[PDB]
Amino acid sequence: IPEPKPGDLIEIFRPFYRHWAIYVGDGYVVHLAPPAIVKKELLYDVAGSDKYQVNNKHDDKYSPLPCSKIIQRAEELVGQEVLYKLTSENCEHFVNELRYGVA
């Protein structure tokens, strides 16, 4: 897999779970983690042995926001709590809000 662009959605294929993250560069992604807390961590470390892919699933319906706006919002949330639990669907929702906005 070539290096993703900043703002790209990353789908991580666990056994029995789909963890999502958004690429913010230099090997880093922003994603949710159990204490949910927003973390900025290296994709190699997050994925471990699991496969992953870029999956900008909704680029056919919505334009991504400007890359600098995606990154600013992702960075503003790093270290902050979110009010829902980790599920595959909640994780995907989280990164979709970053790439596409609240709509």
Numbering used by the authors: 5 to 39, 58 to 125
Task: Copy text verbatim from the article accompanying this structure deposition.
The small GTPase RAS proteins operate as “molecular switches” that fluctuate between inactive and active states. These switches can be activated by the exchange of guanosine triphosphate (GTP) for guanosine diphosphate (GDP), which is promoted by guanine nucleotide exchange factors (GEFs). The H-REV107 gene is a known member of the class II tumor suppressor gene family that has been identified as a growth inhibitory RAS target capable of suppressing anchorage independent growth in vitro an in vivo. Here, we found direct interaction and inhibition between KRAS G12V and novel H-REV107 peptide.
Several studies have shown that H-REV107 is ubiquitously expressed in most normal tissues, however, expression is lost in human tumor cell lines and tumor samples. In contrast, induction of H-REV107 expression resulted in growth inhibition of RAS-transformed cells in vitro and in vivo. Characterizing the molecular details describing how H-REV107 binds KRAS G12V is essential to understanding the molecular mechanism through which H-REV107 inhibits oncogenic KRAS mutants. It is known that the H-REV107 protein family can inhibit the RAS signaling pathway, but the molecular mechanism responsible for this is unknown. We obtained the fraction crystal of the N-terminal domain (residues 1–125), but the electron density for residues 1–4 and 40–56 was poor. The crystal belonged to the orthorhombic P212121, with unit cell parameters a = 42.935 Å, b = 52.997 Å, c = 62.796 Å, and α = β = γ = 90 o. The structure of H-REV107 comprises four α-helices (α1–α4) and six β-strands (β1–β6). The H-REV107 peptide was synthesized in a water-soluble form and its fraction was designed from α1 to β5 (amino acids 65–74).
